Amino acid sequence: GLDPVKRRPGMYTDTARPNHLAQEVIDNSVDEALAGHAKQIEVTLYKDGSCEVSDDGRGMPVDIHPEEKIPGVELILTRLGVSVVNALSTKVELFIKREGSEHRMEFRDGNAASKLEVVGTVGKKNTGTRLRFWADPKYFDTPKFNVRALRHLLRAKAVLCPGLTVKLHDEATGEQDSWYFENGLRDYLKGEMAEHEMLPADLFVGSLKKDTEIVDWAAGWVPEGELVQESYVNLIPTAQHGTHVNGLRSGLTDALREFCDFRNLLPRGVKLAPEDVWDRVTFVLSLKMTDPQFSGQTKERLSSRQAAGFIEGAAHDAFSLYLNQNVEIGEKIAQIAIDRASAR
Secondary structure, eight states: OOHHHHHOGGGTSOTTSTHHHHHHHHHHHHHHHHTTSOOEEEEEEOTTSOEEEEEOSSOOOOSBOTTTOSBHHHHHHHOOOHHHHHHTEEEEEEEEEETTEEEEEEEETTEEOSOOEEEEEOOTTOOEEEEEEEEOGGGSSOSOOOHHHHHHHHHHHHHHSTTOEEEEEETTTOOEEEEEOSSSHHHHHHHHTTTSOOEEEEEEEEEEEOSSOEEEEEEEEOSSSOOOEEEEETTEEOTTOBHHHHHHHHHHHHHHHHHHHHTTOOOTTOOOOHHHHHTTEEEEEEEEOSSOOEESTTSOEEOOHHHHHHHHHHHHHHHHHHHHHOHHHHHHHHHHHHHHHHTO
């Protein structure tokens, strides 16, 4: 039943505005992209207050449940995720392209307002899902979407999913956006820091997979300029960073320290502190792990001690190898850290 959601919307979404509802719909399309079955996602904010999210994924299920006797997609929207979107919307209309046909279903106040209809015939490779919802203003402080927050969120999806093209279309202003990063983290960070020189010039990139745990990152040392420092856990942004970031920091520090030691770069009585190594670092870090635990006054920080050791080892081994194969660049990075230490 969806009544519990209607009774206490604040327990299922952010009632300040409909951004979170859109987020839930967007996450479904991003999962298709992460599974390698989607390359295009487009979000549209309409003047009537509705929001539509369209993807070229495999498409939501259009079969009928043997027990329930209703469309599988209907069960998704009316049971227990995206069901919250439907429970808090006066209307929801979705079109699904799957198995050579385009289907349509409508909902009103969370209840099915039609059957699963065959509305078109399409090629076998033409698949995808488009879901438009009309949030019921009586549940939110305002029906208006924070477009700026949505732009950042959509861009992140393109960053975290290499090869995925994400678009935003705001009908009120007519403004259009398009994000695409063939490389993912590296292309994004390079573009954001294109105005400043850094070491390595093309960043220092690395990644490691042990199977349930996966980490990806791009980092560089910037002598001068605003630093980009963003971290994520399962595509969830951690504004307050945390254990995964501490691991990256500790790992890069250990490798650099060892480098300065072997190369005999340390001035008299000077030892590198992690702050010396981290102060001018610009980076993007993306971690994927099972059931991540968050801390902080707002859950915006990761606490998984496991994540620290995992990333520390990944960054340590990866950065040591890079430094040893790029001595000149390595000594320039070490110097940035040494200058901080000597100047402390």
